[PDB]
Amino acid sequence: KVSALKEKVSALKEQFLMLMFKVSALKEKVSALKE
Amino acid sequence: KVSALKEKVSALKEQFLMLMFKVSALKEKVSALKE
Amino acid sequence: KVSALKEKVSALKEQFLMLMFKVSALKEKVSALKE
Numbered sequence: 253k254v255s256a257l258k259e260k261v262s263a264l265k266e267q268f269l270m271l272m273f274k275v276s277a278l279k280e281k282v283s284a285l286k287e
Numbered sequence: 288k289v290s291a292l293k294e295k296v297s298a299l300k301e302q303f304l305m306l307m308f309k310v311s312a313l314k315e316k317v318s319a320l321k322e
Numbered sequence: 323k324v325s326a327l328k329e330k331v332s333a334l335k336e337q338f339l340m341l342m343f344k345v346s347a348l349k350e351k352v353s354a355l356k357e
Contacts, residue, residue: 253289253293254289254323254324254327257289257292257293257296257327258323258327260296260300261296261327261330261331261334264296264299264300264303264334265330265334267303267307268303268334268337268338268341271303271306271307271310271341272337272341274310274314275310275341275344275345275348278310278313278314278317278348279344279348281317281321282317282348282351282352282355284321285317285320285321285355286351286354286355288324288328289324292324292327292328292331295331295335296331299331299334299335299338302338302342303338306338306341306342306345309345309349310345313345313348313349313352316352316356317352319356320352320355320356
């Protein structure tokens with residue numbers, strides 16, 4: 253169970269990094285429209 | 288402790304799915320403003 | 323291992339809260355551009 257959990261947290265950390273990239277890119281695009 | 292942790296990860300995975308939906312919907316709205 | 327995992331989940335929950343704030347602030351900014 254602890255091993256399954258560690259893999260689940262690993263995959264969720266990878267998901268978070270990809271969503272942080274997606275949100276930073278969106279924030280920059282919105283700043284190009286409006287300061 | 289392992290059980291408490293599994294529930295905490297479960298709830299955080301549900302949180303992530305809802306934030307992915309929110310960010311995809313926002314990305315589409317921003318693309319409607321600017322390609 | 324369980325302790326390391328609990329800290330990893332703690333830090334990821336703090337990361338999520340900060341990304342939820344960032345996305346809510348971006349959503350409001352986009353609504354100021356377009357209803």
